[model samples]
Target chain A: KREYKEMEGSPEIKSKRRQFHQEIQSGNMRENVKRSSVVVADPTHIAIGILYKRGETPLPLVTFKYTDAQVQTVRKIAEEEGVPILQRIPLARALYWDALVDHYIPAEQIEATAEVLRWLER
Target chain B: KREYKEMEGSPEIKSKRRQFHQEIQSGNMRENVKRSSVVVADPTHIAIGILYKRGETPLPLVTFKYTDAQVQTVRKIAEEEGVPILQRIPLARALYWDALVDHYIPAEQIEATAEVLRWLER
Candidate 1:
C-alpha cells in the first residue's frame, strides 16, 4: 500500500510525461489564443507553456513538445545578431517558441523571455 | 544516486503540482481564449484543461484547478434536464466544464462529453 504512493514518481511519472508528449506530437492538441504569455521550463519534458497573467496567476494556454533542433534553427537565424546576453544564454528554444505567439512573458521568468523576443525580432 | 531519479515522482511531482495550483488560485493564472475546449480530470488537482485539437494530438490550452463544489453547481443547473445517463455519472464535473466551451468532444471520451453538453444545454 505505502509502496504504491512511492511509485508515483518513478516509472509512472515517465509514463505521465510520455503520454502528454504523445498528445502534443500526435496532434491531440490544437493552438489556442495567439495572444498569451509563453515560457519554457523543465528538465525532462522540455516543452513550452503559453499562458497569460490574471493579476499574478499563470493560467495555461498551450504546451507542446520542444526540441533541440528547433533551438539550433533559431540561433542560426540570429547568427548575425550575436544577440543580447539573455538571448545568447540558451533558454532560447523555449523563449523563442513563446515569442512566436505570446504577447508578454510572465514576470516569474521575466528576464530571459524579454531578451529572446528581442533576439528573434532582431 | 538512482534513488534521486526515483524521487521525482513523489515529493517533486507534488511540489510541481502544488506550484501550478498555487498559481491558479493565487491569481497567478489569467484566463485566455475563452473559446478553447475545457475538460477536467485527475485524482488530485482535478482542474480543467482547455485545449483544442491539432488533429489527433491533444495540445493543452489551459489547465487550472477544478472542484467538487463546482460540480454540484453545474448539476443544479441541469436538475431540470433529468439529465442524460452519461451526464448523471460522476464524470459530470469534468464534462460539464468542457461542455461550457468545447465545440466537440474527442472520440476518446465521446459518450459522456456529448451527454454533458446536452445536460448543460437542457
Candidate 2:
C-alpha cells in the first residue's frame, strides 16, 4: 500500500488541479467526464480517472491518481460527489504503471484504452 | 530487470508447462492463444499470455509467463513460433499483479479482458 498526503492547496497541487480542470473544460477531458470515464483498483490500492476526446487528443489523460487508503477516500468522494467509479484493472494498472499522478496516459496504450472507453459507452 | 533461469526440463518446470498447455488446450487458455492474446511488460520485466473463450469460461487464463530478458526470448519465440504478441500494459499489469506464473487471471477482470479481446478481434 502507498501513502498519500493531504495537500493544503499548495502552489504546485493547486496549479496542477487548475490545469486538470482547465483541460477538462476545454479539451478531451470534458468528454471523459461526460462519459464518466474512471478506473479503480481492487482492495483500494490504486485509482485513476481518465478522460478522452477524439480529434482533440489521440489518447486519454489522467485526471486523478490516488493510492492505498486514498483510493477508498477517492471512491467515497466520487460516489458522494456523483462521479462514476469504474472497475478496469488493466487500464488502472497501465495508467498507474506509466503515468504520474496527473498526466496523460502513455502513448502505447492509447488504442486499448480507447477501446475500453468505447466498450464502456456501448 | 528480473533474472530468469533456463530450465533444463526439470520436473517442476515441465510439469507446470505441461499444465499450462493442457489448460490452454482444454479451456479458456486455448482462446487466449488463438486470439494471440499476449501481454508484455515495458522494457521487459514481465510477459503474460492470456486466452479466453466464451461459454467455456467467463475470463482469460494465463498460458505463458516470463520475465526480464526472457520476455524478449518469449517474444522472439512467439515470432519464430508464429504467435500473436499483444501490447496491453494494463492487462499485463493486472495479470502480473494478481496472478502467479501459469495461473488463471482474476475473476473480477474477466469482463474488461473480454472486452479487450473483442476489440482486438475487431
Candidate 3:
C-alpha cells in the first residue's frame, strides 16, 4: 500500500519531492496581497515566526517524516517584512480544513487548529 | 531470546496461549468489591460506549494494537446489565497486567515507548 511505501521511503526522498513542488508553486497566492501592502500594517507575523524558530510551545512540533525549515525561512522573511503572522496562519475552521484536505493529520493537527479565538472560545 | 519468538508467533498462538490459562482461574479477587458496585451512579456509561462504538473523541486515539473491542463488549454487557463503564474498563487493567509485567519493549529505546502507549501514540 502507499502508506507502507511512505513508511519505508528515506526521509531525504520525501523532503526533496515536497520542496520541489513547494518551490515551483512559490508565491502564486501572494500577488493580490502585495497590492495594498503599505496600507495594512502587520508585525505579529515576525513575532510568531520568531517563536517558531525558537521552538516555542504553540508552533507545531517538527518530525522526522517531514521538515519545515522552508516554512521557517518564510516566517523569517515575513517577520523582516513586518507582516502579522496571524494573517498568514489560517483561522480555526479554515486551518482544520487545510489540514484535513492535505491529509496532514496526527501531530500536525495543531497547525490545522491555529486559531487564537478557538483557543479562547473553547 | 524470547523476543524473536513473539514477533514470529501467529495471532492465534498468542491469544489462545494467553487466554487458555486466563479462563482456568477467574475471579480470584472480586470477592471483595461486591459491596462497591453501589455508590457509583454514573449514567453516561451507556453514552460513552455508544460514542466509542461510534468513535468520538478527545479521548486517546485508537489504532490496530490494543484492541478496544474487548473493552466495548464489556460496555455492551454493562449497559444491558446497567453498570458503569469507566470503572469496568480500567478495573480490568489489572485484568491484563501480565502482558507488560512480562517483557514487551521493542528492540530500540524510542520504539520501546510502545511499552506504555500504543505504537501510534508518540
Best by TM-score: 2
Which regions of candidate 2 deviate over 4 angstroms?
A1-36, A54-58, B1-122
lDDT of each: 0.35, 0.54, 0.27
Q: Please give, for residues B22-58, the per-residue lDDT of candidate 3 as tens digits.
A: 3443332222122112111112121111111114322
Q: Candidate 2 on B21-121: residue-level lDDT in tens?
A: 43445434334334445554443545677655567544556665544445656666667656667776666765654443444555656676677677757
Ranking by TM-score: 2, 1, 3
What is the C-alpha lDDT profile of model 3 across A1-122, one tens digit per residue?
A: 11213354454444334333334433322331221111111222111211122233333321111111222344444456654334433332222212211123224334433343244234
Q: What TM-scores do the predictions have?
A: 0.22, 0.35, 0.20
Candidate 1 Cα misplacement greater than 4 A, ranges: A1-122, B1-11, B21-35, B40-47, B55-62, B72-122
Docking band of candidate 2: incorrect
Candidate DockQ values, in order, are: 0.02, 0.02, 0.01
Winner on TM-score (1 vs 2): 2
TM-score of 3: 0.20
lDDT of 1 by residue, A6-119 (tens): 224543353344343334443322232122244343332233544434554342323333432332332332233332222232453434222222223323446655554454
lDDT of 2 at B107: 63
Chain B only: TM-score of model 3: 0.26
* TM-score of structure candidate 2: 0.35
Q: How well does candidate 2 score on lDDT at residue A70?
A: 54
Model 1, CA-based lDDT? 0.35
